[PDB]
Amino acid sequence: VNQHLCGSHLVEALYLVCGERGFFYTX
Amino acid sequence: FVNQHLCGSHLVEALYLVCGERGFFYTX
Amino acid sequence: VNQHLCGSHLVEALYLVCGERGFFYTX
Amino acid sequence: FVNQHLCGSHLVEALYLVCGERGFFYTX
Amino acid sequence: VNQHLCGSHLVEALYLVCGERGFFYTX
Amino acid sequence: FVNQHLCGSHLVEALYLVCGERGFFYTX
Amino acid sequence: GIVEQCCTSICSLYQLENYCN
Amino acid sequence: GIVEQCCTSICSLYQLENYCN
Amino acid sequence: GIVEQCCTSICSLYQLENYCN
Amino acid sequence: GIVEQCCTSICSLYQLENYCN
Amino acid sequence: GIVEQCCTSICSLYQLENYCN
Amino acid sequence: GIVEQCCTSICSLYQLENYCN
Ligand SMILES: [Cl-]
Ligand SMILES: [Cl-]
Ligand SMILES: [Zn+2]
Ligand SMILES: [Zn+2]
């Protein structure tokens, strides 16, 4: 669960950092 | 967009839950 | 606190899964 | 709605904090 | 990391509670 | 606003990540 | 409805509390 | 309860559906 | 694109699943 | 500090108000 | 104001950084 | 992987950029 919660925040963060580039999320 | 920007934030949260272990690419 | 943080994510999740049905959150 | 959809997401987060131990029903 | 995740939720919360007043976040 | 309200929520999340240890003031 | 009331105008914490249990 | 069921272990989407109206 | 499809109309979970790996 | 005060134990809404402007 | 600048146009991370301490 | 790299310790913005397209 702790990992699940972290991923949610990772994804928001990648979203802001990467911008027009987009990103991949692979756990 | 701004509206488009806010929406994307919610899209990725939704993809995160839906895709689960599979993961995803976000390309806008 | 760990439980408080989890509930926030639960609620977002129920929101997406349930859609027009809506949901109840009872801790 | 889309705008309505995005708003609902924020409504439930707010109800979560406001209602606390009481909890809530979300019916749209 | 646990602290990082908590701060994110703190900030959303301060945002709702404080309203027009605004708030300061200092870790 | 409502649109302005939803946007602010995302602004503070973004400032949180960007500012990091520095922190920030939110004044609207 | 809550969608009706609070997505057209901003609802305060006190207004939102009305939808608690 | 959902906290019991879904905050100690991750609940699938199917599981979460149990808490819809 | 996903922005095109799902920010103009609400996309269901099933629609969103199309963008998974 | 707020991290000290509110990330080890849950802070009430009244407590969080201490950090408003 | 930040609401003025960044809710009318999208503000980059670099623009947002201006509002840090 | 990003979970390995960024959920055990906090990843800087520069680090997260590694996972952009
Ligand atoms: Cl969390
Ligand atoms: Cl929004
Ligand atoms: Zn969280
Ligand atoms: Zn939003």
Curated annotation (Swiss-Prot), chains A, C, E:
Effect of residue 23 to S: In HPRI; Los-Angeles
Domain of life per record: Eukaryota
Effect upon mutating residue 9 to D: In HPRI; Providence
The protein's name in its UniProt record: Insulin B chain
Species this chain originates from: Homo sapiens (Human)
